[PDB]
Design a protein around this motif. Structure first.
Motif, PDB file in Angstrom:
ATOM      1  N   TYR B   1     -10.195  13.085  11.015  1.00  0.00           N
ATOM      2  CA  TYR B   1     -10.291  12.299  10.639  1.00  0.00           C
ATOM      3  C   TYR B   1      -8.703  12.218   9.862  1.00  0.00           C
ATOM      4  CZ  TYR B   1     -10.996   7.268   9.292  1.00  0.00           C
ATOM      5  OH  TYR B   1     -10.298   6.463   8.419  1.00  0.00           O
ATOM      6  N   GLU B   2      -7.648  11.134  10.550  1.00  0.00           N
ATOM      7  CA  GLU B   2      -6.481  10.659  10.392  1.00  0.00           C
ATOM      8  C   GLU B   2      -6.609   9.355   9.490  1.00  0.00           C
ATOM      9  OE1 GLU B   2      -2.249  10.766  12.218  1.00  0.00           O
ATOM     10  OE2 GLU B   2      -3.787   9.683  13.260  1.00  0.00           O
ATOM     11  N   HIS B   3      -6.346   9.992   8.213  1.00  0.00           N
ATOM     12  CA  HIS B   3      -6.032   9.134   6.842  1.00  0.00           C
ATOM     13  C   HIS B   3      -4.147   8.505   6.983  1.00  0.00           C
ATOM     14  CE1 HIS B   3      -6.726   6.312   3.984  1.00  0.00           C
ATOM     15  NE2 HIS B   3      -5.422   7.149   3.101  1.00  0.00           N
ATOM     16  N   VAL B   4      -3.908   7.564   7.499  1.00  0.00           N
ATOM     17  CA  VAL B   4      -2.637   7.075   7.137  1.00  0.00           C
ATOM     18  C   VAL B   4      -2.431   5.772   6.392  1.00  0.00           C
ATOM     19  CG1 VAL B   4      -0.681   5.905   8.362  1.00  0.00           C
ATOM     20  CG2 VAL B   4      -2.589   7.703   9.652  1.00  0.00           C
ATOM     21  N   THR B   5      -1.816   5.881   5.154  1.00  0.00           N
ATOM     22  CA  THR B   5      -1.391   5.131   4.317  1.00  0.00           C
ATOM     23  C   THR B   5      -0.138   5.004   3.996  1.00  0.00           C
ATOM     24  OG1 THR B   5      -1.849   4.749   1.670  1.00  0.00           O
ATOM     25  CG2 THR B   5      -1.638   7.291   1.932  1.00  0.00           C
ATOM     26  N   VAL B   6       1.061   4.259   2.853  1.00  0.00           N
ATOM     27  CA  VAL B   6       1.979   4.100   2.378  1.00  0.00           C
ATOM     28  C   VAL B   6       2.463   3.763   1.046  1.00  0.00           C
ATOM     29  CG1 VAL B   6       4.289   3.187   3.591  1.00  0.00           C
ATOM     30  CG2 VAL B   6       2.947   3.047   4.689  1.00  0.00           C
ATOM     31  N   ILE B   7       3.302   4.670   0.159  1.00  0.00           N
ATOM     32  CA  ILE B   7       3.287   4.637  -0.543  1.00  0.00           C
ATOM     33  C   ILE B   7       4.845   5.016  -1.061  1.00  0.00           C
ATOM     34  CG2 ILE B   7       1.404   5.735  -1.651  1.00  0.00           C
ATOM     35  CD1 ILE B   7       3.654   8.488  -2.590  1.00  0.00           C
ATOM     36  N   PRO B   8       4.987   3.762  -2.464  1.00  0.00           N
ATOM     37  CA  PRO B   8       6.424   3.954  -2.913  1.00  0.00           C
ATOM     38  C   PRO B   8       7.035   5.262  -2.861  1.00  0.00           C
ATOM     39  CG  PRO B   8       5.281   2.551  -3.763  1.00  0.00           C
ATOM     40  CD  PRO B   8       4.375   3.320  -3.355  1.00  0.00           C
ATOM     41  N   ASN B   9       8.896   5.391  -2.307  1.00  0.00           N
ATOM     42  CA  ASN B   9       9.318   6.406  -2.596  1.00  0.00           C
ATOM     43  C   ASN B   9      10.006   6.551  -4.027  1.00  0.00           C
ATOM     44  OD1 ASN B   9      10.656   9.071  -2.265  1.00  0.00           O
ATOM     45  ND2 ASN B   9      12.880   7.594  -1.725  1.00  0.00           N
ATOM     46  N   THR B  10       8.710   6.790  -4.752  1.00  0.00           N
ATOM     47  CA  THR B  10       8.635   7.145  -6.954  1.00  0.00           C
ATOM     48  C   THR B  10       8.361   8.202  -6.977  1.00  0.00           C
ATOM     49  OG1 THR B  10       8.863   4.123  -6.649  1.00  0.00           O
ATOM     50  CG2 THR B  10       8.635   5.563  -8.450  1.00  0.00           C
ATOM     51  N   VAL B  11       9.230   9.408  -7.783  1.00  0.00           N
ATOM     52  CA  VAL B  11       8.614  10.568  -8.225  1.00  0.00           C
ATOM     53  C   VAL B  11       7.608  10.274  -9.575  1.00  0.00           C
ATOM     54  CG1 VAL B  11       9.018  12.822  -8.890  1.00  0.00           C
ATOM     55  CG2 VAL B  11      10.367  11.661  -6.587  1.00  0.00           C
ATOM     56  N   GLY B  12       6.854  10.236 -10.205  1.00  0.00           N
ATOM     57  CA  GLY B  12       5.926  10.924 -11.314  1.00  0.00           C
ATOM     58  C   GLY B  12       5.003   9.908 -11.847  1.00  0.00           C
ATOM     59  N   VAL B  13       4.891   9.149  -9.976  1.00  0.00           N
ATOM     60  CA  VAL B  13       3.578   7.740 -10.379  1.00  0.00           C
ATOM     61  C   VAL B  13       2.780   7.865  -9.562  1.00  0.00           C
ATOM     62  CG1 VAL B  13       2.842   5.139  -9.482  1.00  0.00           C
ATOM     63  CG2 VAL B  13       5.288   6.174 -10.171  1.00  0.00           C
ATOM     64  N   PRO B  14       1.153   8.713 -10.085  1.00  0.00           N
ATOM     65  CA  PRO B  14      -0.045   9.174  -9.296  1.00  0.00           C
ATOM     66  C   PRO B  14      -0.382   7.913  -8.475  1.00  0.00           C
ATOM     67  CG  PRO B  14      -0.148   9.766 -11.040  1.00  0.00           C
ATOM     68  CD  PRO B  14       0.825   8.765 -11.509  1.00  0.00           C
ATOM     69  N   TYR B  15      -0.788   7.761  -7.441  1.00  0.00           N
ATOM     70  CA  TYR B  15      -1.017   6.960  -6.146  1.00  0.00           C
ATOM     71  C   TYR B  15      -2.571   6.792  -5.918  1.00  0.00           C
ATOM     72  CZ  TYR B  15       3.281   5.242  -5.948  1.00  0.00           C
ATOM     73  OH  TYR B  15       4.668   4.741  -5.968  1.00  0.00           O
ATOM     74  N   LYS B  16      -3.513   6.018  -5.902  1.00  0.00           N
ATOM     75  CA  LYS B  16      -4.949   6.615  -5.078  1.00  0.00           C
ATOM     76  C   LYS B  16      -5.576   5.556  -3.872  1.00  0.00           C
ATOM     77  CE  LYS B  16      -6.945   8.250  -8.987  1.00  0.00           C
ATOM     78  NZ  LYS B  16      -6.329   7.634 -10.462  1.00  0.00           N
ATOM     79  N   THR B  17      -5.777   6.645  -2.841  1.00  0.00           N
ATOM     80  CA  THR B  17      -6.157   5.947  -1.973  1.00  0.00           C
ATOM     81  C   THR B  17      -7.254   6.628  -1.502  1.00  0.00           C
ATOM     82  OG1 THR B  17      -5.249   5.804   0.832  1.00  0.00           O
ATOM     83  CG2 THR B  17      -4.931   8.038  -0.540  1.00  0.00           C
ATOM     84  N   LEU B  18      -7.799   5.069  -0.551  1.00  0.00           N
ATOM     85  CA  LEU B  18      -9.258   5.685   0.195  1.00  0.00           C
ATOM     86  C   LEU B  18      -8.844   5.938   1.146  1.00  0.00           C
ATOM     87  CD1 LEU B  18     -12.182   4.568  -1.111  1.00  0.00           C
ATOM     88  CD2 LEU B  18     -12.181   2.655  -0.418  1.00  0.00           C
ATOM     89  N   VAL B  19     -10.770   6.749   1.203  1.00  0.00           N
ATOM     90  CA  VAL B  19     -11.133   7.135   2.769  1.00  0.00           C
ATOM     91  C   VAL B  19     -11.819   6.558   2.992  1.00  0.00           C
ATOM     92  CG1 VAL B  19     -10.452   9.316   4.317  1.00  0.00           C
ATOM     93  CG2 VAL B  19      -8.901   8.953   2.171  1.00  0.00           C
TER      94      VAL B  19
END
Lengths: 49, 49, 334
Positions: B1-19
């Motif tokens: 299953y292909e999960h596609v998301t977009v995150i800001p180009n910022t280092v050191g920030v953990p992002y949560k994505t719901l699949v």
């Protein structure tokens, strides 16, 4: 109950040092110049950008 | 299953994505910048000292 | 290096008449990277080396059953559809110039005058060096870049993987002692494995007996833990040791050299207003190329096979035309 494990992988040929093509990223070229000038009955060479 | 998301180009920030695959229990993936790289092709003109 | 290595027996799909065998001249790999057409052939035997490891170009060493034996270099042959010209021999390697073919055969004649050969399917039709398909090499001509396998016996760049040899299976070592298995070593080191209990495994130097065991349930082989062998995919890996391997330099490495070769002529040229007309008469396929000498070159090319009239537009900036191997012609309007 005897098994044979067949193993294989792929590498550069012995020819790679002699026969090869290089992939380059080409950007912002530096223009350089020279030329032939008949100056005072003599031929002078000018090499300039 | 292909999960596609977009995150800001910022280092050191953990992002949560719901699949959410239909008919399958939700999956939460934490993503944090790995260390992108922009390496320009260099051509040495001269050195100074 | 030949004091540590040895010739060997390996699988060959065709030992003559289409039948497979455990060949003492088994084909390992055929290399054809050399643009000059030279073939670098790898075999299971060792040329130029005697059984005592001494170097002798008139001799060849091959695996004769359990022990290596000496053979004549003169008896060695290479052939495709017809015989090949052998250019160099050293150890497992042969250099040969072969005519067009669909198979490759390497053979020799042993001590007992018995011929041994190995045939593998190999498409050999080497490409043309340059623009002329010639037979014999000239002393003088056009110097063109080409690759070859150097005839130097020296081993400095290219290499092969080596590891401990294998064992020789021999069912005659085992016999039915009433209703048991009798393994008779006969002054040899035998590796045995039985599908029974107790001491069913071992590297023995003495005679062994396996009671309540059948002869068909056992496997026996003569070994000799004292040698290196090419890491051959036609020979099994040593079961005891893991990924243990060594490496040795090989003769005849591929190198960039020069190949000597040939040249061409000029079409009948007529002119018109911003137009050039050429009557091309090629004696063989000739590449015609042209470009404008301005901002928009608009490069065009075509292989001219026979008599063809070409009408080309000559712009103000000029037109450059290249006809085969000739220097480019330049045209400008008046």
């Amino acid at each position: 109950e005897n098994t044979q494990l067949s193993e294989a992988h792929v590498e550069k040929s012995e020819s790679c040092k002699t026969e090869f093509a290089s992939a380059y990223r080409a950007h912002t070229a530096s223009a350089s110049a020279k030329l032939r000038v008949l100056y005072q009955g003599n031929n002078i060479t000018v090499t300039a950008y | 299953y292909e999960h596609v998301t977009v995150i800001p180009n910022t280092v050191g920030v953990p992002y949560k994505t719901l699949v959410n695959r239909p008919g399958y229990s939700p999956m939460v993936l934490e993503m944090e910048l790995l260390s992108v790289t922009l390496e320009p092709t260099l051509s040495l003109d001269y050195i100074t000292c | 290096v030949y004091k540590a290595t040895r010739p060997y027996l390996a699988h060959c799909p065709d030992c003559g008449e289409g039948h497979s065998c455990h060949s003492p001249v088994a084909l390992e790999r055929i290399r054809n990277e050399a643009t000059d057409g030279t073939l670098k052939i790898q075999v299971s035997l060792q040329i130029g080396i005697k059984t005592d490891d001494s170097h002798d170009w008139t001799k060849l060493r091959y695996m004769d059953n359990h022990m290596p034996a000496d053979a004549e270099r003169a008896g060695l042959f290479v052939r495709t559809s017809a015989p090949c010209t052998i250019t160099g021999t050293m150890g497992h390697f042969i250099l040969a110039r072969c005519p067009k073919g669909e198979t490759l055969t390497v053979g020799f004649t042993d001590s007992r005058k018995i011929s041994h050969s190995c045939t593998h399917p190999f498409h050999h039709d080497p490409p043309v060096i340059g623009r002329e398909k010639f037979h014999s090499r000239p002393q003088h001509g056009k110097e063109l870049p080409c690759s070859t396998y150097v005839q130097s016996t020296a081993a400095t760049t290219e290499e092969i993987e080596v590891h401990m040899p294998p064992d020789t299976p021999d069912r005659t070592l085992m016999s039915q002692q009433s209703g048991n298995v009798k393994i008779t070593v006969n002054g040899q080191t035998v590796r045995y494995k039985c599908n029974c209990g107790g001491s069913n495994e071992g590297l023995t130097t003495t005679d062994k007996v396996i009671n309540n065991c059948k002869v068909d349930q056992c496997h026996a082989a003569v070994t000799n833990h004292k040698k290196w062998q090419y890491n051959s995919p036609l020979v099994p890996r040593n079961a005891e040791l893991g990924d243990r391997k060594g490496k040795i330099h090989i003769p005849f490495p591929l190198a960039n050299v020069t190949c000597r070769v040939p040249k061409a002529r000029n079409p009948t040229v007529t002119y018109g207003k911003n137009q050039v007309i050429m009557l091309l008469y090629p004696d063989h396929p000739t590449l015609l190329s042209y470009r404008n000498m301005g901002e928009e070159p608009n490069y065009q090319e075509e292989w001219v096979m026979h008599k063809k009239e070409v009408v080309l537009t000559v712009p103000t900036e000029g037109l450059e035309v290249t006809w085969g191997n000739n220097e480019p012609y330049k045209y400008w309007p008046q």
